[PDB]
Amino acid sequence: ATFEIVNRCSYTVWAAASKGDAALDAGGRQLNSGESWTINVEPGTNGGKIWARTDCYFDDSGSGICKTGDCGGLLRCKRFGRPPTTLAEFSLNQYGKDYIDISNIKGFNVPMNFSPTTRGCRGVRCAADIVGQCPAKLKAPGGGCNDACTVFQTSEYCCTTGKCGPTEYSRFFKRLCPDAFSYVLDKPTTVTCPGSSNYRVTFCPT
Numbered sequence: 001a002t003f004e005i006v007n008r009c010s011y012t013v014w015a016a017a018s019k020g021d022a023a024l025d026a027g028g029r030q031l032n033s034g035e036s037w038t039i040n041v042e043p044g045t046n047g048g049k050i051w052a053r054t055d056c057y058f059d060d061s062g063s064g065i066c067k068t069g070d071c072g073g074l075l076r077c078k079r080f081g082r083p084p085t086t087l088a089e090f091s092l093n094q095y096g097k098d099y100i101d102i103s104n105i106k107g108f109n110v111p112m113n114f115s116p117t118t119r120g121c122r123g124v125r126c127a128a129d130i131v132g133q134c135p136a137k138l139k140a141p142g143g144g145c146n147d148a149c150t151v152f153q154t155s156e157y158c159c160t161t162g163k164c165g166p167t168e169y170s171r172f173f174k175r176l177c178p179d180a181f182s183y184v185l186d187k188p189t190t191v192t193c194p195g196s197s198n199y200r201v202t203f204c205p206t
Contacts, residue, residue, distance in 0.1 A: 001092055002198040004038045004117065005050060007031035009204035013052040013110060016069060016077040019045055027076040028053075031203075043093045043196060050088040051081050052110040052203050054143055067142045068109040083107040084144030086126060086180075088114040088201045098193040102126045103181040104173040108134075109144035113205035121193035126177035127206045135172055147173075159184035 005015045012032050017024035017039055025039035041048060053069035062075035069085045071077035084107025090100045101124060102114055108130040115123025134145035148157040148169035156164050162185075166174070170183035179189050
């Protein structure tokens with residue numbers, strides 16, 4: 001499957017793509033404002049994610065640091081990124097269908113649209129100014145809006161036992177972005193697409 005990753009932000013981002021224990025395609029690349037990077041993701045990839053990283057520095061070897069979304073200091077990510085990260089999440093070719101969503105469970109750094117480029121389903125979007133409107137206690141001093149689990153490390157925020165409810169903090173993310181997951185047990189906003197669909201992830205869609 002193809003994923004065209006498009007940076008519409010006015011700032012550079014370093015795109016990342018991983019399924020947690022491995023890179024997808026090259027795993028990461030710099031995207032200046034306006035640039036597009038097309039990746040190939042193997043059919044059947046389960047639990048893949050794409051995200052933006054901000055304010056990165058990399059040496060000649062591809063080692064360094066990002067202020068949001070850092071994946072072990074690598075340009076080419078092999079693992080998931082450090083919160084806060086808005087997440088485009090997908091599982092492909094799962095009993096004949098693809099499943100896509102956006103999540104704010106690991107916080108928010110960059111606004112996102114995640115849409116099919118092929119027929120048969122709708123896109124999802126989280127494009128509100130979550131960083132600007134972020135509750136004081138959630139603001140990440142390194143940049144972005146943290147989720148409550150990251151900040152407070154409680155069973156209720158992290159849904160550790162599988163029995164958690166919405167919270168004042170999850171309701172903030174849900175109010176700004178109704179079509180993204182706000183907490184682990186949120187009413188799902190996952191979209192079913194035809195198996196083997198192709199996609200575009202656009203940072204800063206509006």
